[PDB]
Swiss-Prot record, chain B:
The chain holds residues 195 to 276 of 427 of the full protein. Required for the processing of the 27S pre-rRNA. Probably involved in the step of the processing of the 27 SA precursor into the 27 SB intermediate. Interacts with LOC1, NOP12, SIZ2, ULS1 and WSS1. Sumoylated. Residues 40-71 form a coiled coil. Belongs to the EBP2 family. It comes from Saccharomyces cerevisiae (strain ATCC 204508 / S288c) (Baker's yeast). This is rRNA-processing protein EBP2. It is found in: Nucleus, Nucleolus.
From Swiss-Prot, chain C:
It is found in: Cytoplasm. GO terms for cellular component: cytosol; cytosolic large ribosomal subunit. It comes from the Eukaryota. Belongs to the eukaryotic ribosomal protein eL13 family. Present with 133000 molecules/cell in log phase SD medium. There are 2 genes for eL13 in yeast. GO terms for biological process: cytoplasmic translation. Component of the ribosome, a large ribonucleoprotein complex responsible for the synthesis of proteins in the cell. The small ribosomal subunit (SSU) binds messenger RNAs (mRNAs) and translates the encoded message by selecting cognate aminoacyl-transfer RNA (tRNA) molecules. The large subunit (LSU) contains the ribosomal catalytic site termed the peptidyl transferase center (PTC), which catalyzes the formation of peptide bonds, thereby polymerizing the amino acids delivered by tRNAs into a polypeptide chain. The chain holds residues 21 to 128 of 199 of the full protein. Keywords: Cytoplasm, Phosphoprotein, Ribonucleoprotein, Ribosomal protein. One of its GO terms (molecular function) is RNA binding. The keyword Cell wall biogenesis/degradation does not apply. This is Large ribosomal subunit protein eL13A. The lineage of its organism: Eukaryota, Fungi, Dikarya, Ascomycota, Saccharomycotina.
Swiss-Prot record, chain E:
Present with 31600 molecules/cell in log phase SD medium. One of its GO terms (biological process) is cytoplasmic translation. This is Large ribosomal subunit protein eL36A. Component of the large ribosomal subunit (LSU). Mature yeast ribosomes consist of a small (40S) and a large (60S) subunit. The 40S small subunit contains 1 molecule of ribosomal RNA (18S rRNA) and 33 different proteins (encoded by 57 genes). The large 60S subunit contains 3 rRNA molecules (25S, 5.8S and 5S rRNA) and 46 different proteins (encoded by 81 genes). The keyword Ribosomal protein applies.
Swiss-Prot record, chain F:
This is Large ribosomal subunit protein eL15A. Belongs to the eukaryotic ribosomal protein eL15 family. Residues 135-156 are annotated as: Disordered. The gene is RPL15A. GO terms for biological process: cytoplasmic translation.
Amino acid sequence: QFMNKQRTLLISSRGVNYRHRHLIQDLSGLLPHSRKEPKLDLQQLNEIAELYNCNNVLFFEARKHQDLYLWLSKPPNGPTIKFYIQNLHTMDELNFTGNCLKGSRPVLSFDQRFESSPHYQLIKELLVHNFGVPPNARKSKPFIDHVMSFSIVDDKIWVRTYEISHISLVEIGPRFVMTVILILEGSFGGPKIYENKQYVSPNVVRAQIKQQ
Amino acid sequence: VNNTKAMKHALERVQLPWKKHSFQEHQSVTSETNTDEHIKDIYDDTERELAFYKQSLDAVLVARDELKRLKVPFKRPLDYFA
Amino acid sequence: RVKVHFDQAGKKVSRRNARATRAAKIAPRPLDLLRPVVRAPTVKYNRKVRAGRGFTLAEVKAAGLTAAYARTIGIAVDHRRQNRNQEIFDANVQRLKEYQSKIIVFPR
Amino acid sequence: LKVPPTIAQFQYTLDRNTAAETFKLFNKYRPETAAEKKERLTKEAAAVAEGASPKPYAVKYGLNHVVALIENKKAKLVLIANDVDPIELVVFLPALCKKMGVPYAIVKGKARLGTLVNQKTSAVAALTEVRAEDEAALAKLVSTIDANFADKYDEVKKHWGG
Amino acid sequence: AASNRTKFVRSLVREIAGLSPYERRLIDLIRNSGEKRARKVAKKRLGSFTRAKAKVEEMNNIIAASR
Amino acid sequence: GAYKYLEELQRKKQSDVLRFLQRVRVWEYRQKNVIHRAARPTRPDKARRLGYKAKQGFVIYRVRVRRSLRATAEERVGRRAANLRVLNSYWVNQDSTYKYFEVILVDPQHKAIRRDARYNWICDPVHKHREARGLTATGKKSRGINKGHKFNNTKAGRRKTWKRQNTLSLWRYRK
RNA sequence: AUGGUG
RNA sequence: GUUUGACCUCAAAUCAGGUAGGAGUACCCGCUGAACUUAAGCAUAUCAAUAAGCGGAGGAAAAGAAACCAACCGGGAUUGCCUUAGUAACGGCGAGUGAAGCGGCAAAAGCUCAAAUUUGAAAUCUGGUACCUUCGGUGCCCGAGUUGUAAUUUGGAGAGGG
């Protein structure tokens, strides 16, 4: 058979949008090894991992129809990357032209800089498992379709996807602007293991503006 | 916070059996460029849309060395659309 | 479409008249109702103090009268408001005590 | 069609005789008519107008009132019709009294109960505390509904009918 | 809090009402498979893993209380 | 009192008894007109709870709608009985090809309910044909009127909020 | 385009 | 007991008492809903959640006593006005589209139901009828009504007793 096997649970929070729903469209159709579920505090997720028996878990938070935190782990052990997204470019834009065959396993471009700090090594790992399509995830097709990359822009770190034209390419995406907010012990548990103070939650910058 | 310790034992804990096999599973290669170079204006989008333009370009080239060599190729079948 | 208020001259005359009748019957009473003194929210304005809606249950109690009677003595009461700030509570209580001492009441 | 065990417990009712007996009793207890209250209160009206009250008795028939007597618990026997326009209304009584150990009795017709009460209908009419005259006839009566209805009819709890 | 009147009433009417087939299959594959596919199909029919609890637990409490 | 027993039951509609009673009663209804009066509620619970009283003056029709709905129900009876002001309505039973709703009305003319200060207000003219203007329990659900940000569309009216939200108004001494 | 008279 | 009667359901009446339709439709509440055109004659948007159409009332209507706003030393039903503001946000990030709380001020108002037994008493109500002081009252008789009319209570609590 195969060495690498994954399944991912897809559940976002309440207060959904077309930024949200467009995203669950893409990412849900991007992970042919993933299970897709109704939307729903912090405990029950690793247990849903027991019910549908899933080895990869992620979660999409909605605050004031703004803050999208991606919690990321592989249950029950995790650990988790609590995350925040900005400048979302999904696949659904006019200037992203692609039409991708379903279920394929991309090829991931990424920068070597991540290893320079261990936490980027771990978002490396957990993403390699979660979004990396195990060959071949059931429902897929062989060969290859698209390329997906990730790397650091002032610790605000894109992921993207191009559809390949036999080597030329034109971006599928979703073009994505990534951060790392805080790493927590296990899967949805424990003390804050690693923080990046770089991030200032927009709620907090409001807390600044009010004071003039 | 700022903890490499549990970050290290989390490196031991989470990692996939990537040490133990060939390339055929995740298909993610560590590139040589850091792409924090040659970006003069962080505000410029297409500067590192060029940088990663050639990063998925070259990545998928040498990965075509891989996947002619690993005998599953890249190119989308254009005989079939489904 | 465009509405242009040329009655800002007249509407104020009919508003003077309205208050001129509302005091042509209620004459001894003062057109109005006693009202609390209430601090505003929102770090911007919190330093300001304000008119509120009605005093409270508690503020009315510890001022020595009962709600259902208050409403009929001229006080105004708001049952969904929650006394917390000692000081605001104080100024309120005081303000009632005042009102009490100043009023009269007729017999029946 | 097949009917659920909680139904078809109606359709099992008291016989010619036992019912006949129950009404031999209650027909003593007819809650006084309207012109009655007008009677007594007119006579006393003139009395205390110019010129010692034992506790009155009747059967306690208000449906809300009746279920109210139960769950206290108060009552002694309860009579439940077999036909309610919204058949829903009474479905829970025979269970209820069951769990509460009350002598419930299914008597046929809501006109038949309704007539003892000075109404067009009842569908439930019941009594708790009775005068001492018939107290024995009560103890035996409830013993008779226990013995007739209750005893061999545990079967009705299972067994979809129809 | 609830007044035990209503605890009684719910307990009772639950017995008097008869059991919707969802309940029936739930208890069924509990007495056969058990919680795994139970909460599977219950959460799948009902809302959530907050609301898979109420029913599934309720079921086991009924079997052990059907004694 | 019963009614907590009633509802605490009626919250179970897939139960076995209610299954049955359903399958029967729908059959009966289907054999009659589209607007067929009843003299008595089916469910006396939601009768009481929506403000049915049992006395002279209150009327219960029952309408069978094809398969919005509950409003449609309100309408056809509304057109049918033109003396009666509507009051409220709710959901009894559903065929596959029909939902059956049953509808609570009050006779404005009937001098027993023109008294009774609780219910007499409905005799005033502004309530003619409340159903056509969507003032009811569901009538005001479709309009989307309640308190919250969840509706900033309308706490007054869509036509309203939009009409006054874009048109430009001048003072005299300009602003 | 809307709604109407032939 | 093959009669007799009660209840249900459903009829019918040139019986009494009522009531609805049409007119107007400035305004207001709903449902339906285009094109010119703008934007490149564009698939979006726009024009517009408009106009013509259909349904329904009033002197106003509608909304209304938080399953609200908030995030602070907290305001406290609605509606309206100045203001937040052309701000956040939406933008082939294009035409352009576009808010809300806070703040000032006008006017200010609160409440009903259902959910516990009146059980030592349906205490309620329509109508008829006679008289009277008649936008009604009282006596009488039916009828509704116990599958619930009246009283008590609406979480701001409340109830029973003392």
